[PDB]
């Protein structure tokens, strides 16, 4: 049995609003809307959270029953679709410990892990993998290129209790190594371990909005995340491109 710490597919209309909390740290955060977009694999399945306002900060998050990854594997997975042809805007998630106030979450709130694609002009086309360690948020020393097209892509981070990690895009490995080698933490066997995870958050800036996020999964099972990804992103992809191609 895989431990399913968090799953979000937005399959039940407006009920997501009971699961996700808007921060009030700023009064002028942009709004997320539930949408499948202009083109999609399936109208119902491909509903997800869409940024709806240009040049805005975004702060929305969802709690789950707290857990620690000590002694086990951690997998964070979601899909990102920059349907708008983005110029500049984030597409990454943050995982927060139990202490976070969801009503006051912002860019500088303390987080454990930040993972996902970031785009800001041609210079920044990066997959972030950031670990909080000894009071610092440490960025991976490797260049992982993010996808920049209009289509749905799957992002997966795997963190294992032997201090190894793996990044997959579209369910295929793009980067791999050990935590000791690929970040400047600098023989600590417990770097990977955090005492709690309790909230997943979207803390973004976007110029051109319209990004859609879907199919969030936090789990301890690599094989399951891979299956879920094929059942999810893997079914979206071909039908989505078909519909877009139809659209001259
Ligand atoms: O990038 C590592 C960093 O990420 C997290 O913090 C994010 C930043 O605080 C910021 O993201 C940047 C923002 O940049 C632009 C705009 O706001 C600036 O004023 C402008 C001036 O140079 O440049 C950009 O236009 O957005 C872009 C697009 O996503 C990012 O690439 C920039 O990094 O704001 C976001 C949203 O609040 C933060 O998530 C982590 O919190 C931090 O620890 C980490 O080091
Ligand atoms: Ca969905």
CATH number for position 130 = 2.60.120.200
Residue 138 Cβ inside 6 Å of ligand 1? The answer reads: no
List all residues 6 or more positions away from 54 whose beta carbon is below 8 Å from its beta carbon. 206, 207, 208, 209
Any domain includes 105: yes
139 occurs within a structural domain: yes
What's the 6 CA to ligand 2 centre distance in angstroms? Answer: 14
- Asked if residue 118 has its Cβ within 6 Å of ligand 1, the reply is yes
Ligand closest to CA 57: 1
Which residues share a beta bridge with 247? none
Q: Does residue 153 sit within a domain?
A: yes
Within a domain: 246: yes
Residue located nearest, by CA, to atom 17 of ligand 1: 205
Structure tokens at 140: 């991976």
Strands 212-219 and 93-96: unpaired
Residue 183 domain-assigned? no
Residue 186 CA: distances (Å) to CA of 99, 141, 183, 191: 27, 13, 8, 10
Q: What is the resolution of this structure in A?
A: 2.0
Domains identified in the chain, total number: 1
Containing structural domain, residue 222 = 1-178+193-248
Buried b (16+ CB within 10 A) or exposed e, 131-157: bbbeeeebebeeeeebbeebbbbbbbb
Ligand 1 atom at minimum distance from 114 CA: 40
- DSSP-assigned beta bridge partners for residue 7: 217
């Amino acid at each position: 049995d895989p431990a399913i710490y968090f799953k979000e597919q937005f399959l039940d209309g407006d009920a997501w609003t009971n699961r996700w909390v808007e921060s009030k740290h700023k009064s002028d955060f942009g709004k997320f809307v539930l949408s499948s977009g202009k083109f999609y694999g399936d109208l119902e399945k491909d509903k997800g959270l869409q940024t709806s306002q240009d040049a805005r900060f975004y702060a929305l998050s969802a709690k789950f029953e707290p857990f620690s990854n000590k002694g086990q594997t951690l997998v964070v997975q979601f899909t990102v679709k920059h349907e708008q042809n983005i110029d500049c805007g984030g597409g990454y998630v943050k995982l927060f410990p139990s202490g976070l106030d969801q009503k006051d979450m912002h860019g500088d709130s303390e987080y454990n892990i930040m993972f996902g694609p970031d785009i800001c002009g041609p210079g920044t086309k990066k997959v972030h993998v950031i670990f909080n360690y000894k009071g610092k948020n440490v960025l991976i020393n490797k260049d992982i290129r993010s996808k920049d097209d209009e289509f749905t892509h799957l992002y997966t981070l795997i963190v294992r209790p032997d201090n190894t990690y793996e990044v997959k895009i579209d369910n295929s490995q793009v980067e791999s190594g050990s935590l000791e080698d690929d970040w400047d933490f600098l023989p600590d066997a417990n770097i990977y371990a955090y005492d709690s995870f309790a909230v997943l958050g979207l803390d973004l800036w976007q110029v051109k909005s319209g990004t859609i996020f879907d199919n969030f999964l936090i789990t301890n099972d690599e094989a399951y995340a891979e299956e879920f990804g094929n059942e999810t992103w893997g079914v979206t992809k071909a039908a989505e491109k078909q519909m877009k191609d139809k659209q001259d």
